[PDB]
Design a protein around this ligand. Structure first.
Ligand SMILES: NC(=O)c1ccc[n+]([C@@H]2O[C@H](COP(=O)([O-])OP(=O)(O)OC[C@H]3O[C@@H](n4cnc5c(N)ncnc54)[C@H](OP(=O)(O)O)[C@@H]3O)[C@@H](O)[C@H]2O)c1
Ligand SMILES: Oc1cc(O)c2c(c1)O[C@H](c1ccc(O)c(O)c1)[C@@H](O)C2
Length: 296
């Protein structure tokens, strides 16, 4: 079961590539590294928007599983990759660059809406093309959710005051990067994830923004002022159409005002949830992730 990962030097990719190697899977990583190579990765060169070159790669390296983690500005570059997988005809599982919310249920404002249009466009190509697929809807990476930052976990949470979105009482789910990686790779050849959406709903990590603030306060041993950032504030940031800041603002609204991660049931047959798939296999808690920062 050989795995090809596009986007392995990206923020999500690094965790997915590291996890794959840790699980002892043959892992090829597409290059436009050192740590990944020292752990066993085989680097192969190409871009996912070049159909004929991807066909060559999938054929030559006998690739079984393809995982794409390209960024929000490269979503449509996956069109060529899909056409290439359809042509070689041998792919056992494709995971497109999802790694967030359920794009078919959520309804963020613009310019968030348009990234989801692109993601839905890929999904429909995947399915009409007959590629077997798994969609990873892993909710929010465990960070302080800054309203205009695409990689928020790369920044330390606040040490002056908290900007609390709305009432600060809408739940979201937070998952460590290492857990996104680990559980993503368990799904790629699981019979139960074939042609499914996989939702990450770790119940201990279901927290609102106020609760998150208190977890950080308890780490810093000190309280901060809390101020309100309103729905209008966020929609005005979204309305500015500055890419990718306004996109993240759209998503923050969807998450912490409209409650998109938690407002639907996963009880239907096309939806599965990670903790029920992989029981007695604990997620890292937000307390524990925030502990990581407290080593600055
Ligand atoms: N839920 C969350 O908290 C969360 C947060 C972050 C992102 N996400 C989602 O995760 C997914 C990954 O985003 P990201 O932020 O990790 O992206 P990123 O950090 O921008 O990394 C994207 C990776 O894809 C590569 N790539 C882009 N175009 C390529 C192409 N045409 N050919 C081959 N490789 C290419 C890039 O390599 P180069 O550097 O060489 O261009 C880079 O390594 C996105 O769909 C995003 O919506 C979710
Ligand atoms: O569905 C989602 C949910 C999220 O929380 C996020 C998503 C997508 O993607 C966002 C994003 C937007 C533009 C980008 O270029 C990118 O790499 C990531 C990310 O910052 C946070």
């Amino acid at each position: 079961g050989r795995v090809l990962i596009a986007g392995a030097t990206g923020f999500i990719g690094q965790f997915v590539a590291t996890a794959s190697l840790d699980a002892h899977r043959p892992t090829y990583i597409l290059a436009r590294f050192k740590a990944l190579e020292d752990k066993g990765a085989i680097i192969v060169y190409g871009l996912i928007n070049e159909q004929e070159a991807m066909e060559k790669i999938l054929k030559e390296h006998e690739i079984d599983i393809v995982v794409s983690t390209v960024g929000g500005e490269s979503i449509l570059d996956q069109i060529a990759l899909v056409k290439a997988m359809k042509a070689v005809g041998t792919i056992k599982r494709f995971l497109p660059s999802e790694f967030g919310h359920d794009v078919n249920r959520a309804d963020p404002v613009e310019p968030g809406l348009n990234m989801y249009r692109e993601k839905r466009r890929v999904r429909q190509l995947v399915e009409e093309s007959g590629i077997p697929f798994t969609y990873i809807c892993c909710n929010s990476i465990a960070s302080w959710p800054y309203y205009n930052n695409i990689h928020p976990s790369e920044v330390l949470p606040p040490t002056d005051f908290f900007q609390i979105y709305g009432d600060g009482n809408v739940k979201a789910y937070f998952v460590a990067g290492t857990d996104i990686g680990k559980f993503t790779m368990k799904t790629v050849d699981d019979v139960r994830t074939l042609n499914k959406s996989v939702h990450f709903r770790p119940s201990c990590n279901c927290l609102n923004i106020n609760e998150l603030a208190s977890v950080w306060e308890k780490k810093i041993g000190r309280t901060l002022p809390r101020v309100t950032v309103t729905e209008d504030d966020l929609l005005a940031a979204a309305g500015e159409n500055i890419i990718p800041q306004s996109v993240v603002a759209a998503f923050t609204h969807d998450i912490f005002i409209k409650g998109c991660q938690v407002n639907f049931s996963i009880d239907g047959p096309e939806d599965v949830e990670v903790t029920t798939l992989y029981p007695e296999d604990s997620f890292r808690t937000v307390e524990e992730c925030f502990g990581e920062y407290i080593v600055k």
